[PDB]
Design a protein around this ligand. Sequence first.
Ligand SMILES: NC(=[NH2+])NCCC[C@H](N)C(=O)O
Length: 706
Amino acid sequence: MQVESLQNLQVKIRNDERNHSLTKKYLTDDIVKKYQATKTSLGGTLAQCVNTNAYNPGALLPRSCDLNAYETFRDFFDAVIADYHKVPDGKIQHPKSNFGDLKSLSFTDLNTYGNLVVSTRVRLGRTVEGFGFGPTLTKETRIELENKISTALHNLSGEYEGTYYPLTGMSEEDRIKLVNDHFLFRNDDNVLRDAGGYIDWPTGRGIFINKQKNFLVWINEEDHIRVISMQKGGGLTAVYKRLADAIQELSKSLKFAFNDRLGFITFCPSNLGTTLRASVHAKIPMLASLPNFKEICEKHGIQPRGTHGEHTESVGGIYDLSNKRRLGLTELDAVTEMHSGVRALLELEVMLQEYNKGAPEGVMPVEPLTYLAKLLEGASIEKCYTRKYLTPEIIKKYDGKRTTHGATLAHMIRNGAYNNRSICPRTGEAECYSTFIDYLDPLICDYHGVKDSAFKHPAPTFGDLSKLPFGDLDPTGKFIVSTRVRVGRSVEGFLFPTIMSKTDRIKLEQVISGALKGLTGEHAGTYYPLTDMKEEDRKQLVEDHFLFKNDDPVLRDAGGYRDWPVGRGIFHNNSKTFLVWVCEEDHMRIISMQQGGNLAAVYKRLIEGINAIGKSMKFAHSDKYGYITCCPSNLGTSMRASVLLKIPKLSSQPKKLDEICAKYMLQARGGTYDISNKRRLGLTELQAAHEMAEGVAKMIEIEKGL
Ligand SMILES: NC(=[NH2+])NCCC[C@H](N)C(=O)O
């Protein structure tokens, strides 16, 4: 196989913005310098290994010119392998092959868990010693290898008796039939093509099928041998035993390449070690729809792959689920990982299907409350409010209860269940604060340091916007880089961004954007829908650090990025001093900000904007808690006023710093600090903003003191 110089290929791979391969990561100048003239014992080069990466930027891994590539270019491949297979300290190792005690081995049938499994399949691969891969084979040696292998296959007994079909000479009718039965491989993978996989096509290649059509062998498709056992249903035990028996028998005839670092050598580094991929095709539509579906699988040792194109338009939810591990465990370990993980996932699909019977369409499905309560046990019952008030009696009372529009207690603890450092829940709608009052009210009281009162929450008390008790906290040069006040708001009648449906989001966005497009004067601006945005607008939003990404795991697992990015957007005025985020965590975050320390002007602009928006919709409001928001941490005023404060001196006596913050009820985050009022509930908007001002005024006058 003739390919470009390694240095050329490196430049191509590096200059390609679409390429994010591990090949790109580890094919360094030093690596090129070391290996650009080196040949394996079969005469292969590193250029031949990385060639496909130069032309296929989507490819993650190199391939190998022959089995000696891993040793010959070890500094490169060990780095790639350690990275891909997540090998701890680059301490790559692999145990001797062990399929287990076949006579006594037994796994439960996977269809026990809801009868969701269409089929079960286990695959392995082998390299025959003494022969190269695609780039280093000759036409003759590939055929010699094929002959060696078909002869070994012809010698399998009973169960494995069947027919060898060489590709060469195969009629097009047989070709059509065999690909229709999914027994035949084709030359249709460009990554494989550019790694030398189809040289001298179709010679030296073929397939073998037994009479029962549950055992299938590919010769020289990519690896020397790929062996596949398969059948309808969930009989993993039989599939795996059938596979194990055959390869053990074949081993008596063929010498397979193995070393105690990588295990069984394969053409692609992803399939080293056991080479084993045990899998099922399963119907798991509800599980597949969870926001952290992928993470859930990985945590159970499972890798999911979509099967789109393989089924009808109205039947998706069918996935391939396999062991995620190949290297660093035995075959028995790997199929056990598969069985255990898949069993857990199918049991979870069954639980989802049952717990969400009757729930509104488009509303986020949720795991059973008691399941999530177990995951939440990893949270500190001392710092995590979500767990602290989730008592046995609360679980018993509220399990299986829904609000009128479908919100559950399970919904609201989910973010904590899957992110144990998260300390507050995320509610599903305003009604949550009465339907689940026994959970939420003590939690709220605890978080905000308050207690049950006979009196209605104070009405919105914004103050006289022409005679405010604060002005410019820093007229002079700089203690204050910038000032900001924001509030959260929920719109009456809508489920919150956690669980709301796609149609809900679309309607919400029509209500809110309609109001925003009508704002005038200082508040006049432009709405930028995340769905229909001009790219230059998109770039500029990112430039200004006006971000709205689906990248927070806490929000994600509460469901806040579902049906992305429909109904989401950013509004701001031309000056970028008044902005609204639409449907992130709350229906709205309404924000006023500007350079300098003029809090009175930021506050005034904010209040006038809230009022203007409020003309077109009713804000969710509570006699108990004031303005209602998704997170209970942001009730009452839902107001956060803040400054970007430069205090080089005081930040270096940091506990007469963290003591002001304490006694003036401020929060600080990093001599430049972001300082904000900590209180939200139990005070008026005016007091909230005044507390920040008084606290910041103290800090500043403390600062000049040093
Ligand atoms: N046997 C194989 N086809 N291996 C290819 C695995 C794909 C690989 N992770 C890549 O993107 O390079």
